[PDB]
Protein backbone atom coordinates (compact mmCIF):
# COMPACT_ATOMS: atom_id res chain seq x y z
CA UNK A 1 0.00 0.00 0.00
CA UNK A 2 3.03 2.26 0.56
CA UNK A 3 6.58 2.64 -0.78
CA UNK A 4 9.44 4.71 0.61
CA UNK A 5 11.24 6.99 -1.91
CA UNK A 6 14.68 6.47 -3.41
CA UNK A 7 16.75 9.66 -3.47
CA UNK A 8 19.58 10.90 -5.63
CA UNK A 9 21.34 14.25 -5.53
CA UNK A 10 23.57 15.38 -8.36
CA UNK A 11 24.49 18.18 -10.74
CA UNK A 12 23.22 18.55 -14.29
CA UNK A 13 26.73 18.95 -15.65
CA UNK A 14 30.11 17.92 -14.12
CA UNK A 15 30.74 20.00 -11.02
CA UNK A 16 33.13 22.91 -11.63
CA UNK A 17 33.35 25.92 -9.27
CA UNK A 18 32.51 29.41 -10.46
CA UNK A 19 30.63 27.99 -13.45
CA UNK A 20 26.82 27.91 -13.68
CA UNK A 21 25.06 24.57 -13.23
CA UNK A 22 21.90 22.96 -11.81
CA UNK A 23 21.44 21.09 -8.55
CA UNK A 24 19.17 18.09 -8.87
CA UNK A 25 17.32 16.02 -6.31
CA UNK A 26 15.52 13.04 -7.82
CA UNK A 27 12.80 11.08 -6.04
CA UNK A 28 11.26 7.86 -7.35
CA UNK A 29 9.76 4.48 -6.52
CA UNK A 30 7.76 6.04 -3.72
CA UNK A 31 4.01 5.77 -3.64
CA UNK A 32 1.46 8.05 -2.00
CA UNK A 33 2.08 10.95 -4.37
CA UNK A 34 2.16 13.42 -1.52
CA UNK A 35 5.85 14.16 -0.75
CA UNK A 36 7.95 17.09 0.51
CA UNK A 37 11.29 17.91 -1.07
CA UNK A 38 13.65 20.77 -0.26
CA UNK A 39 17.13 21.68 -1.40
CA UNK A 40 19.60 22.97 1.16
CA UNK A 41 22.59 25.24 0.78
CA UNK A 42 24.66 25.04 3.93
CA UNK A 43 21.48 23.80 5.57
CA UNK A 44 18.99 26.44 4.47
CA UNK A 45 15.80 25.74 2.46
CA UNK A 46 16.68 27.22 -0.95
CA UNK A 47 14.45 29.98 -2.33
CA UNK A 48 13.59 29.34 -5.99
CA UNK A 49 13.14 25.60 -6.49
CA UNK A 50 11.07 23.98 -9.24
CA UNK A 51 10.16 20.35 -9.89
CA UNK A 52 8.95 18.21 -12.78
CA UNK A 53 5.34 17.19 -13.26
CA UNK A 54 4.23 14.18 -11.22
CA UNK A 55 4.42 10.87 -13.05
CA UNK A 56 4.73 7.13 -12.41
CA UNK A 57 6.76 4.13 -13.51
CA UNK A 58 5.61 0.66 -14.62
CA UNK A 59 5.05 -0.59 -11.06
CA UNK A 60 2.77 2.42 -10.47
CA UNK A 61 5.25 4.13 -8.14
CA UNK A 62 5.81 7.88 -8.64
CA UNK A 63 8.85 10.03 -9.35
CA UNK A 64 9.75 13.71 -9.43
CA UNK A 65 12.79 15.82 -10.16
CA UNK A 66 13.44 18.83 -7.99
CA UNK A 67 16.06 21.23 -9.27
CA UNK A 68 17.51 24.72 -8.96
CA UNK A 69 19.97 26.80 -10.93
CA UNK A 70 23.24 27.15 -9.00
CA UNK A 71 26.96 27.90 -9.07
CA UNK A 72 29.03 25.71 -6.70
CA UNK A 73 32.21 26.68 -4.86
CA UNK A 74 34.89 24.66 -3.07
CA UNK A 75 33.18 25.54 0.19
CA UNK A 76 29.39 25.81 -0.17
CA UNK A 77 27.81 22.48 0.77
CA UNK A 78 24.48 21.32 -0.69
CA UNK A 79 21.99 18.61 0.31
CA UNK A 80 18.44 17.44 -0.26
CA UNK A 81 15.67 16.92 2.27
CA UNK A 82 12.86 14.46 1.54
CA UNK A 83 9.74 14.06 3.65
CA UNK A 84 7.19 11.27 3.13
CA UNK A 85 4.57 9.29 5.03
CA UNK A 86 6.76 6.19 4.92
CA UNK A 87 9.42 7.98 6.95
CA UNK A 88 9.91 7.93 10.73
CA UNK A 89 11.82 11.19 10.41
CA UNK A 90 12.83 13.35 7.43
CA UNK A 91 15.68 12.02 5.30
CA UNK A 92 18.63 14.08 4.12
CA UNK A 93 21.26 13.18 1.58
CA UNK A 94 24.38 15.25 1.14
CA UNK A 95 25.50 16.20 -2.34
CA UNK A 96 28.76 14.64 -3.49
CA UNK A 97 30.65 15.91 -6.52
CA UNK A 98 31.96 12.38 -7.25
CA UNK A 99 28.87 10.22 -6.81
Amino acid sequence: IQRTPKIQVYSRHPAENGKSNFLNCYVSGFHPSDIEVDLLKNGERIEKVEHSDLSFSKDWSFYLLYYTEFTPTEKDEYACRVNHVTLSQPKIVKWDRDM
Binding site: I1, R3, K6, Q8, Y10, R12, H13, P14, F22, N24, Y26, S28, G29, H31, P32, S33, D34, S52, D53, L54, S55, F56, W60, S61, F62, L65, Y67, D98, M99
Partner: protein, 260 residues
Amino acid sequence: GSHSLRYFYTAVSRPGLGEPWFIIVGYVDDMQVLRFSSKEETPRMAPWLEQEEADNWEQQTRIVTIQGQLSERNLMTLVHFYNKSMDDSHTLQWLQGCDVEPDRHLCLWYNQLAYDSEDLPTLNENPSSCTVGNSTVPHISQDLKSHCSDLLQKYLEKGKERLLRSDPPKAHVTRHPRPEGDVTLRCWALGFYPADITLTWQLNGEELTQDMELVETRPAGDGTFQKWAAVVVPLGKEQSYTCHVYHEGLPEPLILRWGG
Protein backbone atom coordinates in the same frame (compact mmCIF):
# COMPACT_ATOMS: atom_id res chain seq x y z
CA GLY B 1 11.53 3.08 -36.25
CA SER B 2 8.93 2.43 -33.57
CA HIS B 3 7.69 5.27 -31.41
CA SER B 4 5.27 5.52 -28.52
CA LEU B 5 2.87 7.98 -26.97
CA ARG B 6 1.65 7.63 -23.41
CA TYR B 7 -0.60 9.60 -21.09
CA PHE B 8 -0.03 9.09 -17.39
CA TYR B 9 -3.09 9.88 -15.29
CA THR B 10 -3.24 10.45 -11.53
CA ALA B 11 -6.17 11.39 -9.34
CA VAL B 12 -6.04 11.80 -5.60
CA SER B 13 -9.10 12.26 -3.46
CA ARG B 14 -8.97 14.72 -0.55
CA PRO B 15 -10.51 13.31 2.68
CA GLY B 16 -13.92 14.94 2.65
CA LEU B 17 -12.87 18.57 2.28
CA GLY B 18 -12.71 19.53 -1.39
CA GLU B 19 -12.77 18.06 -4.91
CA PRO B 20 -10.14 15.54 -6.05
CA TRP B 21 -6.83 16.70 -7.51
CA PHE B 22 -5.45 15.31 -10.74
CA ILE B 23 -2.85 15.59 -13.43
CA ILE B 24 -2.20 14.20 -16.86
CA VAL B 25 1.30 14.09 -18.22
CA GLY B 26 1.73 13.06 -21.82
CA TYR B 27 5.00 11.59 -23.08
CA VAL B 28 6.33 10.58 -26.46
CA ASP B 29 9.23 8.21 -26.11
CA ASP B 30 11.31 9.68 -23.29
CA MET B 31 10.25 13.28 -23.78
CA GLN B 32 7.40 15.01 -21.99
CA VAL B 33 5.14 16.78 -24.44
CA LEU B 34 1.97 17.58 -22.57
CA ARG B 35 0.54 18.51 -19.21
CA PHE B 36 -2.90 19.05 -17.81
CA SER B 37 -4.13 19.18 -14.24
CA SER B 38 -6.68 20.45 -11.79
CA LYS B 39 -6.91 24.13 -12.53
CA GLU B 40 -5.58 24.93 -15.98
CA GLU B 41 -8.02 25.91 -18.70
CA THR B 42 -6.21 24.17 -21.54
CA PRO B 43 -3.21 21.80 -21.53
CA ARG B 44 0.31 23.21 -21.50
CA MET B 45 2.39 21.71 -24.28
CA ALA B 46 6.14 21.39 -24.59
CA PRO B 47 7.42 24.78 -25.74
CA TRP B 48 9.74 23.13 -28.25
CA LEU B 49 6.82 22.12 -30.47
CA GLU B 50 6.10 24.30 -33.53
CA GLN B 51 3.16 25.62 -31.48
CA GLU B 52 -0.17 26.90 -32.78
CA GLU B 53 -0.83 28.82 -35.99
CA ALA B 54 -4.32 27.36 -35.71
CA ASP B 55 -2.90 23.92 -34.82
CA ASN B 56 -5.62 21.36 -34.33
CA TRP B 57 -5.12 19.97 -30.83
CA GLU B 58 -8.80 19.96 -30.19
CA GLN B 59 -9.34 16.21 -30.26
CA GLN B 60 -6.74 16.00 -27.55
CA THR B 61 -7.69 18.98 -25.42
CA ARG B 62 -11.17 17.56 -25.62
CA ILE B 63 -10.33 14.01 -24.58
CA VAL B 64 -8.02 15.19 -21.86
CA THR B 65 -10.28 17.87 -20.40
CA ILE B 66 -12.99 15.19 -20.13
CA GLN B 67 -10.77 12.55 -18.57
CA GLY B 68 -9.80 15.15 -16.02
CA GLN B 69 -13.26 16.39 -15.15
CA LEU B 70 -14.53 12.87 -14.58
CA SER B 71 -11.79 12.02 -12.08
CA GLU B 72 -14.23 12.63 -9.21
CA ARG B 73 -16.95 10.26 -10.37
CA ASN B 74 -14.25 7.69 -11.04
CA LEU B 75 -12.81 8.06 -7.62
CA MET B 76 -16.20 7.65 -5.99
CA THR B 77 -17.31 4.44 -7.69
CA LEU B 78 -14.00 2.75 -6.91
CA VAL B 79 -14.56 3.68 -3.31
CA HIS B 80 -18.16 2.48 -3.42
CA PHE B 81 -17.28 -0.75 -5.29
CA TYR B 82 -14.63 -1.54 -2.66
CA ASN B 83 -16.23 0.29 0.25
CA LYS B 84 -12.91 1.75 1.39
CA SER B 85 -12.90 4.31 4.20
CA MET B 86 -13.86 7.68 2.76
CA ASP B 87 -11.82 9.12 5.59
CA ASP B 88 -8.68 8.00 3.78
CA SER B 89 -7.25 9.45 0.59
CA HIS B 90 -6.98 6.99 -2.28
CA THR B 91 -5.29 7.50 -5.60
CA LEU B 92 -6.29 6.38 -9.05
CA GLN B 93 -3.54 5.93 -11.62
CA TRP B 94 -4.43 5.28 -15.25
CA LEU B 95 -2.19 4.55 -18.24
CA GLN B 96 -3.17 4.83 -21.91
CA GLY B 97 -1.37 5.33 -25.21
CA CYS B 98 0.08 3.30 -28.04
CA ASP B 99 3.27 2.06 -29.69
CA VAL B 100 3.46 2.61 -33.42
CA GLU B 101 5.53 1.90 -36.52
CA PRO B 102 3.68 2.78 -39.76
CA ASP B 103 6.00 0.81 -42.02
CA ARG B 104 4.53 -2.35 -40.52
CA HIS B 105 0.99 -1.19 -40.09
CA LEU B 106 1.74 -1.81 -36.44
CA CYS B 107 -0.30 -0.05 -33.80
CA LEU B 108 -0.42 -1.33 -30.24
CA TRP B 109 -2.84 0.09 -27.71
CA TYR B 110 -2.45 0.21 -23.97
CA ASN B 111 -5.03 0.80 -21.24
CA GLN B 112 -3.93 -0.07 -17.71
CA LEU B 113 -5.57 1.10 -14.46
CA ALA B 114 -4.74 0.77 -10.76
CA TYR B 115 -6.47 1.63 -7.48
CA ASP B 116 -4.23 2.48 -4.56
CA SER B 117 -1.31 0.86 -6.33
CA GLU B 118 -3.24 -2.33 -6.97
CA ASP B 119 -3.95 -3.35 -10.54
CA LEU B 120 -7.50 -3.42 -11.82
CA PRO B 121 -8.34 -6.39 -14.12
CA THR B 122 -8.46 -6.09 -17.90
CA LEU B 123 -9.53 -9.37 -19.62
CA ASN B 124 -9.64 -7.12 -22.67
CA GLU B 125 -6.25 -8.36 -24.01
CA ASN B 126 -3.35 -6.23 -22.72
CA PRO B 127 -2.01 -4.48 -25.77
CA SER B 128 -5.00 -4.43 -28.12
CA SER B 129 -4.84 -3.16 -31.62
CA CYS B 130 -5.38 0.27 -33.01
CA THR B 131 -5.53 1.63 -36.54
CA VAL B 132 -3.60 3.81 -38.95
CA GLY B 133 -6.17 4.40 -41.71
CA ASN B 134 -5.89 8.19 -41.42
CA SER B 135 -7.62 10.88 -43.50
CA THR B 136 -10.61 12.16 -41.52
CA VAL B 137 -11.14 12.93 -37.82
CA PRO B 138 -14.62 11.36 -37.20
CA HIS B 139 -17.48 12.39 -34.87
CA ILE B 140 -16.69 9.35 -32.69
CA SER B 141 -13.87 11.24 -30.92
CA GLN B 142 -14.62 10.68 -27.20
CA ASP B 143 -12.31 7.70 -27.62
CA LEU B 144 -8.57 8.43 -27.44
CA LYS B 145 -7.70 5.00 -28.81
CA SER B 146 -9.09 5.84 -32.24
CA HIS B 147 -6.72 8.83 -32.32
CA CYS B 148 -3.58 7.60 -30.59
CA SER B 149 -1.88 6.67 -33.86
CA ASP B 150 -2.62 10.08 -35.37
CA LEU B 151 -1.78 12.18 -32.35
CA LEU B 152 1.58 10.45 -32.35
CA GLN B 153 2.41 11.48 -35.90
CA LYS B 154 1.54 15.11 -35.24
CA TYR B 155 3.90 15.17 -32.26
CA LEU B 156 6.62 13.55 -34.33
CA GLU B 157 6.11 16.04 -37.13
CA LYS B 158 6.10 18.93 -34.66
CA GLY B 159 9.18 17.83 -32.73
CA LYS B 160 11.36 16.11 -35.29
CA GLU B 161 14.42 17.91 -33.91
CA ARG B 162 13.91 16.75 -30.36
CA LEU B 163 11.82 13.63 -30.86
CA LEU B 164 13.80 12.06 -33.69
CA ARG B 165 17.03 12.69 -31.85
CA SER B 166 19.66 10.24 -30.65
CA ASP B 167 22.46 11.54 -28.47
CA PRO B 168 25.06 8.89 -27.57
CA PRO B 169 26.55 8.83 -24.06
CA LYS B 170 29.79 10.55 -23.16
CA ALA B 171 31.79 8.14 -20.96
CA HIS B 172 34.84 8.20 -18.70
CA VAL B 173 35.98 6.29 -15.62
CA THR B 174 36.89 7.83 -12.30
CA ARG B 175 39.14 6.17 -9.72
CA HIS B 176 38.44 6.64 -6.02
CA PRO B 177 40.90 5.12 -3.51
CA ARG B 178 38.87 3.25 -0.94
CA PRO B 179 40.90 3.72 2.28
CA GLU B 180 39.44 0.34 3.24
CA GLY B 181 42.04 -1.76 1.43
CA ASP B 182 40.46 -1.53 -2.05
CA VAL B 183 39.79 0.86 -4.94
CA THR B 184 36.52 1.79 -6.64
CA LEU B 185 36.09 2.30 -10.37
CA ARG B 186 33.11 4.33 -11.58
CA CYS B 187 31.92 4.15 -15.19
CA TRP B 188 29.99 7.25 -16.18
CA ALA B 189 27.64 7.72 -19.10
CA LEU B 190 26.21 11.25 -19.46
CA GLY B 191 23.84 13.21 -21.65
CA PHE B 192 22.60 10.23 -23.65
CA TYR B 193 19.08 10.31 -25.00
CA PRO B 194 16.68 7.42 -24.99
CA ALA B 195 17.03 6.49 -21.34
CA ASP B 196 17.43 2.85 -22.23
CA ILE B 197 21.12 2.18 -21.71
CA THR B 198 23.23 -0.57 -20.19
CA LEU B 199 26.59 -0.53 -18.46
CA THR B 200 28.68 -3.53 -17.52
CA TRP B 201 32.02 -4.22 -15.89
CA GLN B 202 34.21 -6.86 -17.47
CA LEU B 203 37.17 -8.49 -15.73
CA ASN B 204 39.59 -10.37 -17.93
CA GLY B 205 36.65 -10.56 -20.33
CA GLU B 206 33.74 -11.55 -18.07
CA GLU B 207 30.58 -9.76 -16.96
CA LEU B 208 30.95 -8.78 -13.32
CA THR B 209 28.06 -9.21 -10.91
CA GLN B 210 27.13 -9.36 -7.22
CA ASP B 211 30.13 -7.07 -6.60
CA MET B 212 28.97 -4.08 -8.65
CA GLU B 213 26.67 -1.13 -7.88
CA LEU B 214 23.95 0.36 -10.09
CA VAL B 215 21.94 3.55 -9.83
CA GLU B 216 18.57 3.99 -11.53
CA THR B 217 19.27 6.03 -14.61
CA ARG B 218 18.34 9.62 -13.71
CA PRO B 219 17.21 12.63 -15.75
CA ALA B 220 19.73 15.46 -16.04
CA GLY B 221 16.85 17.93 -16.17
CA ASP B 222 18.11 19.19 -19.50
CA GLY B 223 16.44 16.57 -21.69
CA THR B 224 19.01 13.79 -21.45
CA PHE B 225 19.79 11.17 -18.82
CA GLN B 226 22.79 10.10 -16.80
CA LYS B 227 23.76 6.79 -15.21
CA TRP B 228 26.85 5.14 -13.79
CA ALA B 229 28.10 1.73 -12.73
CA ALA B 230 30.95 0.99 -10.34
CA VAL B 231 33.16 -1.78 -8.97
CA VAL B 232 35.77 -2.44 -6.24
CA VAL B 233 39.22 -3.58 -7.31
CA PRO B 234 42.63 -4.53 -5.81
CA LEU B 235 45.35 -1.84 -5.96
CA GLY B 236 47.11 -1.39 -9.30
CA LYS B 237 44.76 -3.92 -10.90
CA GLU B 238 43.20 -0.93 -12.66
CA GLN B 239 44.01 -1.53 -16.34
CA SER B 240 42.81 -5.09 -15.79
CA TYR B 241 39.12 -4.09 -15.56
CA THR B 242 37.09 -2.61 -18.44
CA CYS B 243 33.75 -0.89 -18.84
CA HIS B 244 31.26 -1.46 -21.65
CA VAL B 245 28.49 0.98 -22.62
CA TYR B 246 25.71 -0.09 -24.95
CA HIS B 247 23.33 2.43 -26.41
CA GLU B 248 21.10 3.42 -29.29
CA GLY B 249 23.10 6.42 -30.45
CA LEU B 250 26.37 4.52 -30.34
CA PRO B 251 27.81 3.35 -33.67
CA GLU B 252 29.45 0.55 -31.79
CA PRO B 253 29.38 -0.57 -28.16
CA LEU B 254 31.70 1.81 -26.39
CA ILE B 255 34.50 0.21 -24.36
CA LEU B 256 36.44 2.09 -21.68
CA ARG B 257 39.91 1.63 -20.30
CA TRP B 258 40.74 3.27 -16.96
CA GLY B 259 40.94 7.04 -17.53
CA GLY B 260 43.32 6.55 -20.45
